[PDB]
Amino acid sequence: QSACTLQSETHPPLTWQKCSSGGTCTQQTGSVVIDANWRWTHATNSSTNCYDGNTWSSTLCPDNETCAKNCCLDGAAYASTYGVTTSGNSLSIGFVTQSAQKNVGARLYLMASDTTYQEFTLLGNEFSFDVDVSQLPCGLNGALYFVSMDADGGVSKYPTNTAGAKYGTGYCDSQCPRDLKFINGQANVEGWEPSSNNANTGIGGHGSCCSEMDIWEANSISEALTPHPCTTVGQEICEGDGCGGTYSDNRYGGTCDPDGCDWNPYRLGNTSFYGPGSSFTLDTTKKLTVVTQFETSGAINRYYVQNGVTFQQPNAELGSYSGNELNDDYCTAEEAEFGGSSFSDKGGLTQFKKATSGGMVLVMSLWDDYYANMLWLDSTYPTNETSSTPGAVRGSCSTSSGVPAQVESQSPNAKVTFSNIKFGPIGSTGNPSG
Numbered sequence: 001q002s003a004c005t006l007q008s009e010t011h012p013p014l015t016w017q018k019c020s021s022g023g024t025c026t027q028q029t030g031s032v033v034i035d036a037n038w039r040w041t042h043a044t045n046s047s048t049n050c051y052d053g054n055t056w057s058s059t060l061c062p063d064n065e066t067c068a069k070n071c072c073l074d075g076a077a078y079a080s081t082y083g084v085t086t087s088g089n090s091l092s093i094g095f096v097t098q099s100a101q102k103n104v105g106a107r108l109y110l111m112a113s114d115t116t117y118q119e120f121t122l123l124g125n126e127f128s129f130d131v132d133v134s135q136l137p138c139g140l141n142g143a144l145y146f147v148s149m150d151a152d153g154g155v156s157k158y159p160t161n162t163a164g165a166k167y168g169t170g171y172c173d174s175q176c177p178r179d180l181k182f183i184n185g186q187a188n189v190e191g192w193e194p195s196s197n198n199a200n201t202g203i204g205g206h207g208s209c210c211s212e213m214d215i216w217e218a219n220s221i222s223e224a225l226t227p228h229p230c231t232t233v234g235q236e237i238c239e240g241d242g243c244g245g246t247y248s249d250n251r252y253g254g255t256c257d258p259d260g261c262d263w264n265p266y267r268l269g270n271t272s273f274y275g276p277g278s279s280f281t282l283d284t285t286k287k288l289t290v291v292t293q294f295e296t297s298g299a300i301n302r303y304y305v306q307n308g309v310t311f312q313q314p315n316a317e318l319g320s321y322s323g324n325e326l327n328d329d330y331c332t333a334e335e336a337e338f339g340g341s342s343f344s345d346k347g348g349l350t351q352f353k354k355a356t357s358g359g360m361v362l363v364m365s366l367w368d369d370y371y372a373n374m375l376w377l378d379s380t381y382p383t384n385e386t387s388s389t390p391g392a393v394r395g396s397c398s399t400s401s402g403v404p405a406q407v408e409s410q411s412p413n414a415k416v417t418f419s420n421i422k423f424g425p426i427g428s429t430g431n432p433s434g
Ligand SMILES: OCC(CO)NC[C@H](O)COc1cccc2ccccc12
Pocket: 141, 143, 145, 173, 174, 175, 212, 214, 217, 228, 246, 258, 259, 365, 369, 371, 372, 376
C-alpha cells in the first residue's frame, strides 16, 4: 500500500536511555508509530474505504495486487482516536477510546526516525523498563515485546509497499498473524473470512511469521516472560493453514512456535509473588521495574525492583530443573511436565539466539483476546482442566473472564503505562540516567 495524507501523521515522541559498560547512560530521542491495521485504508484518490467493518471493497480490492495499487493507509490521531499519549520517557495506552467510532487498544513500534524502526540487538545486553499495570484487569494484556521485523517495514523487499515504517507496516510475530490487512506489499483480501465475534477483524489467506521475544505479557493479576523461536528467523509470509498459529485450524503446522517457553511465576507454583496489594511480593497497584538480561549462552535472566527492593525471578522446581534462569534445562523440563513439543521442534533457545543476535523491533501494546479471552495468561487453560493438571492454572482469574465485549463495556478506562526504558550491556541499566 501507499500512504495518503488526508489525516497528518505525527509520531508521539518518546525518549529512552542507551547505557554503556563504563557506567553512564545517554538519552536517545525516538517516537512511536501505530500498526497499519488500526489505520483507515482508503482509495488513493478519494475517501472511499477499501476496508470497512470487517469486509473489503469488492471493486477496489478484487485481488491482493490490485487492492494494494488502489489503496492507501492514512494518518492517525494518536490521542483522540487511539488513546495513545507520550510524555518524555513515558507512554500510555488506553483501552477503549470513543471518538467518531469506538477504538480498542493499539500496537505500537519504537522508531529511530520518522521513516525507520529502532532495532535492538538483545544478545549480551539487558532491557529495563517501568510499568504501571494497576488499571489492567482480568482479560487484558499490556505487552512489551520484540519481533524480528525489517527496519523499513518491508519497503526494500516489496516496493508496492511505499507507506513503510512511517505507517507501521511489516508486522510479524510467532503467531504468523493472518488478521493483517497488508503483508509483503499486497493486501490480504484473497481468502478473507470475517471474524464471527469481532465487527472490525478477519483472517486472510496469508500470514506474517517471525521470531518473537515476549519480555512482558501482563495485567494486574498475571505476568509471563516467553521466547518464541521460528525456523526462519525474520519476517516471512505464510500460506493459509500452513501458517499455524492462533489464526489457523492447526496451530502447530508451521514455521513458528506459537506456545513458547513461558515463565509465569504463578503457573510454576509461586502464587504469592505478583498481584494486587500488600499480600504479594510485588504489589501490582504500584509501579514496578522489570529488568531482562540476555546472556550469551542464550539463557534469559530476570529481576524486578519495587520501592528500592530488588527481587530475582523466583526460584521454581519442575521435574529435574531447579533455579530462576530461563535456560535449555528449564524449557525441556517444562515440555516434560506441562506437555508439548513446539518450542523444541522449532530449535529452542539455540534457534532463539539467532533472533537475539540480530536486530529486533520493540513493540508496546494493549489488547483483549477474541480467540481465548486471555485465559492462557491469567486463568485455568484449557478451562475443562483443574489444578491437578500440571501447569493448567496460570492465574487466579475466573475461567469466565475476559470476554472482549464484556471487558470493553465494563473496563473502558483500563490502560497501561510503560516508562523509563533503558538498554545496554548486562549490568549497566541501573546506573544513573543522563
Ligand atoms: O502480547 C503480544 C502477543 C503478540 O502476538 N503475544 C502472543 C504470543 O505470541 C502468545 O500467543 C498466544 C499463546 C497462547 C494462546 C493464545 C491465544 C490467543 C492469542 C494468542 C495466544
